[PDB]
Write a protein that binds this ligand. Structure first.
Ligand SMILES: O=C(O)c1cccc(Nc2nc(-c3ccccn3)cs2)c1
Length: 327
């Protein structure tokens, strides 16, 4: 099998009510206190709006949930409650319903969103270190709380570049980690899916989020966004193997006794592992250092067990300038 190296038993060590989200009974407040101002986004099971709480003039985000998804609603709510006060996790202010339809909605703190496509082309070296450190705080926190985000990607990493604030949003795909549990591999954005997902390995853990974080780090320091740009899930793995190497992929599969879908045999080809320095050029050289490449190499590994944990990543020398500045 496989287990997480950290936080493996933390849900089993807590009360059942902590993780048994199907049994959770939210307290649903009144959505009539909120005035919707503008639509911010739409997903397949939700839409997000800027809103004002008319009772106190607070600006918030309201996420209106398509109500058919009862179990998934309880999951997201219970996870957000468990994460209350976590560093750099979006703050759930309240759980409300339209008092007539009973359609549920989540109310979050407002954050200014600096558009990531534009931001990621103008970050400094220190900015990347700073924001990656802030994102790692959120991931170490949720992992320590027994929760995998499973959808880490630029859209879900809200950065207010004016106030130097970061929030990890959209916990709708998040799940509780339980050792030996088999999880659905249909999670994360294509470009941020770990190799484990792409090879249909269900016994994954928090380390999935560390792959996604590694993909974000690579895109920031190299300026290629997304870094691994597959055309479909099959091609996604080919794009990874063209960097990490094919023999290296096969060694990972062997270690975990992973069966490979035979459609891959026609498309993977044969590829040597590439040096990370191959991605440096005049446009990104100022963002790349030996310590950035060492960190990245320890995140973007096939072997999920061998990837750095969020805490190990935070402790890496790449972040020393950040820690020193916040002291
Ligand atoms: O699902 C969630 O947890 C969640 C929580 C908060 C925000 C969002 N989603 C979005 N927020 C924006 C945004 C916010 C402020 C200014 C401009 N855009 C665009 S999409 C989703």
């Amino acid at each position: 099998g496989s287990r997480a190296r950290v936080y493996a038993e933390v849900n089993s060590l807590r009360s059942r009510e902590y993780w048994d989200y199907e049994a959770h009974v939210p307290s649903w407040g009144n959505q009539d206190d909120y005035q919707l101002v503008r639509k911010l986004g739409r997903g397949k099971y939700s839409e997000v709006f800027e809103a004002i709480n008319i009772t106190n003039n607070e600006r918030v985000v309201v996420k209106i949930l398509k109500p058919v998804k009862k179990k998934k609603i309880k999951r997201e709510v219970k996870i957000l409650e468990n994460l209350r006060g976590g560093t750099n996790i979006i703050k759930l202010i309240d759980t409300v319903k339209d008092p007539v339809s009973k359609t549920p909605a989540l109310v979050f703190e407002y954050i200014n969103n600096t558009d990531f496509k534009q931001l990621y082309q103008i970050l400094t070296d220190f900015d990347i270190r700073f924001y990656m450190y802030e994102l790692l705080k959120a991931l170490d926190y949720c992992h320590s709380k027994g929760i995998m985000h499973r959808d880490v990607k630029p859209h879900n990493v809200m950065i207010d570049h004016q106030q130097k604030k970061l929030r990890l949003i959209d916990w709708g795909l998040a799940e509780f980690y339980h050792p030996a549990q088999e999880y659905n591999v249909r999670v994360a954005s294509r470009y941020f899916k770990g190799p484990e997902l792409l090879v249909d390995y269900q016994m994954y853990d928090y380390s999935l989020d560390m792959w996604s974080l590694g993909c974000m780090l690579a895109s920031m320091i190299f300026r290629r966004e997304p870094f691994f740009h597959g055309q479909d899930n099959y091609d996604q793995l080919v794009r990874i193997a063209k960097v990490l190497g094919t023999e290296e992929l096969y060694g990972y599969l062997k270690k975990y006794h992973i069966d490979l879908d035979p459609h891959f045999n026609d498309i993977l080809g044969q590829h040597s592992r590439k040096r990370w320095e191959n991605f440096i050029h005049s446009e990104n050289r100022h963002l790349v250092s030996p310590e950035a490449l060492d960190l990245l190499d320890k995140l973007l590994r096939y072997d999920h067990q061998q990837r750095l944990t969020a805490k190990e990543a935070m402790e890496h020398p790449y972040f020393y300038p950040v820690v020193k500045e916040q002291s």
